[PDB]
Amino acid sequence: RGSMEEIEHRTVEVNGIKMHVAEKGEGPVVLFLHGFPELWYSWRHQILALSSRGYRAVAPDLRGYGDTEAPESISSYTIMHLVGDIVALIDSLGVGQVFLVAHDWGAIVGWYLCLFRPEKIKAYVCLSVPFMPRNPKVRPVDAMRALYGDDYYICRFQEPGKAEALYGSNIGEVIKSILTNRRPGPPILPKEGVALPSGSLPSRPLPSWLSEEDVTYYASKFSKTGLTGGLNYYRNLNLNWELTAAWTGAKVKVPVKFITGDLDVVYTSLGIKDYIDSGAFKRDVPYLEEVVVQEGVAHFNNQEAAEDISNHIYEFIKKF
Amino acid sequence: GSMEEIEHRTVEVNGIKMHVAEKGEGPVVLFLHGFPELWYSWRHQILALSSRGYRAVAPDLRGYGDTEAPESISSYTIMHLVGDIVALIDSLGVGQVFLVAHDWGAIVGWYLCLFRPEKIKAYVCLSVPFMPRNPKVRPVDAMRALYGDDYYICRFQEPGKAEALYGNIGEVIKSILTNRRPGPPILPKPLPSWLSEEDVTYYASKFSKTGLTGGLNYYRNLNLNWELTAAWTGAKVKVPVKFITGDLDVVYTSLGIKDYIDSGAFKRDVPYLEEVVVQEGVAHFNNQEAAEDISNHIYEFIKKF
């Protein structure tokens, strides 16, 4: 395959914001949507690999991240804004459809993209976060609070400023510890006013899949932006719930290949594995192919199991 | 076949209590009224369609009549409104419905068709055609630029102001319902054959209870709706549609609308649009003013399905 230097970088105005797009290759578009707290850069291995197989790999920094515009208001980060961006981006590519690959928050954008404009998506490779049907009886954050308590990370992510302070008080080290984390189960912070267990321990050494140059690149971007843009996605969960009422009991009709590590925080959170194995996932996503569970892999599977992920993507999309 | 034979009930949909009026048995024909109307605006179609073997269902929309009116302006975005109607359809226990709508109800209807087309067999749309999202400019910003600050929708924006202005609510409704003036309704600052004082009194009784705030709140979300519906820029409606308008309708006579229809642009965005029906000498409230013809127009279309 190629080098990082052969990847093209550019800016496009989409849905009223300037978006950074990285891309390489010619052929059918494969569009990659990163998660939190990541960047287009999280897809580096897949960009090289898929372009080498005759596809046009496209990976933007999402709204609020990296070199993409970060609107000042929290309310500009609802699911409607996010999918709007990606729809505008797809239309800017001059193609009728794309193959879609996404991870974490990017996969949530990807699910609603598949619901809102399915004709734009030929097939979807979804990493980490499966479809989550809307629960009209309770708001999502409320439910998390009732199930995991006030210290569940997403609950603590809600108040403006706090999670930012909790982390940054060295963004390189903060990104590194987030990326190298392998603790399964729901992330439950200590009570407010108590130190994160992290700060008492030395920074853990890098795993094989993540280099210092990688950590340096991540840090260069987040040193400028901070985490606010990314955190604002979580801050719109309850509003998103109001805004998506029309998709209660909706089904995704795009073909999907779902892939997760078995140590993924998401997979090992209450309900998710049961949701998958009970057949509920398949009910909601009738053209879901056989689910892939990656032995001994944690949350950041596009990076940790980069080669296997590039392979799984190609083997799926070449079918269409 | 008698107003009193029409069933009334309350159903919990999308977190609000919704008053629902219905008659007949058979395939559902769901009716969505506009501003400043009620379930009552479909009275003649309800009787007519039930008399033809369909189950006619007509709610008061969010903010109207006997339906709950949430207090927060932000509870009236297009996402809430379609949310309500999707939940309503789900509560009926049938798979698909025939949809008929008018004015703001037609706008709800259009986005319903975009959001959940699988729930709509066919759509009979009155007065308001599909409007493709304009990414260059927000809708109220565009109205102010085109028509200035006294354009009615611009005046509706500031909370309380229109309410105070319209503050005898039945006379107010009477003047809106009988209006036939042409062109951009700009604000300052006898009854037609088809409308009776009886009808006026019903409307006046409900709006004396509710006020106009609920319905005006739909307009106060036009700009936010625009921000929230960017994912549907260039989207196409995949439901069969019959569009019907009176030729004196302010929408039909407004800038670019007749062109949108005649150029074939409407047909481009709604590829299964049938023959547009233009009713001569009919103004905005074509469901009431041409009750019989509208009823027959609905019957003849939905029987094809």
Side-chain angles (χ1 to χ4, degrees), chain A residues 79-121:
Chain A
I79 193 68
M80 302 305 178
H81 289 83
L82 300 175
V83 180
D85 295 336
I86 301 308
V87 173
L89 170 67
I90 289 180
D91 286 337
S92 76
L93 296 181
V95 300
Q97 297 186 293
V98 310
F99 289 107
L100 181 63
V101 178
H103 175 252
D104 186 86
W105 254 109
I108 299 184
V109 179
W111 284 115
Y112 285 94
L113 181 54
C114 286
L115 282 175
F116 299 171
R117 301 299 295 276
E119 77 279 2
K120 292 209 182 302
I121 310 304

Side-chain angles (χ1 to χ4, degrees), chain B residues 53-104:
Chain B
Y54 295 88
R55 178 182 176 197
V57 174
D60 283 327
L61 290 186
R62 179 184 287 240
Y64 281 100
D66 301 322
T67 284
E68 177 176 347
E71 221 187 312
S72 172
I73 292 179
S74 69
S75 286
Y76 296 80
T77 76
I78 186 66
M79 300 304 176
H80 292 86
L81 296 173
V82 182
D84 295 340
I85 307 297
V86 167
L88 173 62
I89 293 178
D90 284 334
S91 76
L92 298 176
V94 309
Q96 295 191 301
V97 306
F98 289 106
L99 182 68
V100 179
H102 178 249
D103 191 79
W104 252 108

Side-chain angles (χ1 to χ4, degrees), chain A residues 15 80 117 242-243 245-246 248, chain B residues 14 79-80 116 228 230-231 233:
Chain A
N15 191 22
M80 302 305 178
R117 301 299 295 276
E242 299 187 36
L243 300 182
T248 301
Chain B
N14 192 31
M79 300 304 176
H80 292 86
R116 300 295 298 273
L228 298 182
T233 308

Side-chain angles (χ1 to χ4, degrees), chain A residues 52 56 64 92 109 118 153 176 190 219 248 279 293 307 309:
Chain A
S52 81
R56 181 185 176 195
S92 76
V109 179
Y153 80 108
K176 177 201 197 187
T248 301
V293 175
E307 181 52 49
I309 289 304

Side-chain angles (χ1 to χ4, degrees), chain A residues 10-291:
Chain A
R10 63 195 174 88
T11 299
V12 205
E13 296 274 1
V14 287
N15 191 22
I17 66 165
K18 317 183 198 215
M19 179 174 273
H20 165 233
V21 173
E23 81 163 272
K24 187 173 175 300
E26 295 181 359
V29 173
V30 181
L31 173 61
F32 301 88
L33 305 182
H34 69 76
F36 173 90
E38 310 184 64
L39 299 169
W40 75 273
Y41 185 85
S42 288
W43 299 110
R44 57 198 180 279
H45 302 299
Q46 290 78 36
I47 295 167
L48 298 180
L50 270 301
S51 57
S52 81
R53 298 194 175 271
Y55 290 90
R56 181 185 176 195
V58 185
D61 285 323
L62 291 195
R63 177 181 297 236
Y65 284 93
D67 301 303
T68 284
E69 192 177 331
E72 269 173 38
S73 299
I74 295 161
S75 58
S76 299
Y77 290 83
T78 78
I79 193 68
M80 302 305 178
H81 289 83
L82 300 175
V83 180
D85 295 336
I86 301 308
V87 173
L89 170 67
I90 289 180
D91 286 337
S92 76
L93 296 181
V95 300
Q97 297 186 293
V98 310
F99 289 107
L100 181 63
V101 178
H103 175 252
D104 186 86
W105 254 109
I108 299 184
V109 179
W111 284 115
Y112 285 94
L113 181 54
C114 286
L115 282 175
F116 299 171
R117 301 299 295 276
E119 77 279 2
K120 292 209 182 302
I121 310 304
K122 199 162 213 71
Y124 181 18
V125 178
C126 178
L127 275 46
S128 181
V129 176
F131 184 71
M132 302 180 298
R134 188 175 175 273
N135 186 345
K137 296 189 162 196
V138 59
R139 305 192 306 164
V141 180
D142 294 12
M144 291 160 179
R145 207 175 301 274
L147 180 60
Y148 296 136
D150 291 36
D151 295 322
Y152 186 54
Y153 80 108
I154 298 178
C155 295
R156 300 282 299 274
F157 276 4
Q158 298 299 309
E159 296 182 76
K162 291 215 199 159
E164 286 91 332
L166 205 49
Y167 278 139
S169 42
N170 72 150
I171 208 49
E173 179 46 49
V174 165
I175 294 298
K176 177 201 197 187
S177 62
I178 289 164
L179 288 186
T180 66
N181 174 34
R182 304 180 59 77
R183 178 187 186 271
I188 298 293
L189 307 181
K191 279 174 166 283
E192 193 174 345
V194 171
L196 286 169
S198 316
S200 41
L201 272 359
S203 55
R204 55 172 89 91
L206 292 176
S208 159
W209 52 272
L210 191 67
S211 67
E212 300 270 27
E213 291 67 36
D214 292 334
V215 166
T216 300
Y217 184 83
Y218 281 109
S220 65
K221 301 308 186 164
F222 284 101
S223 289
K224 280 203 176 326
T225 68
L227 291 165
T228 293
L231 285 165
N232 284 346
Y233 292 40
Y234 293 93
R235 301 191 167 135
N236 281 279
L237 285 172
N238 284 338
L239 181 51
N240 282 354
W241 176 87
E242 299 187 36
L243 300 182
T244 55
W247 298 267
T248 301
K251 286 181 170 51
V252 177
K253 305 106 194 174
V254 180
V256 176
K257 187 179 182 164
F258 179 79
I259 315 173
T260 182
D262 57 10
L263 295 181
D264 196 330
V265 163
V266 177
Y267 191 64
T268 62
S269 274
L270 281 70
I272 300 289
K273 177 166 179 305
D274 291 347
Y275 178 76
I276 295 167
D277 292 324
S278 61
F281 194 8
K282 178 65 167 175
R283 174 201 61 200
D284 294 332
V285 184
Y287 303 103
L288 176 69
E289 238 163 67
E290 180 142 276
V291 166

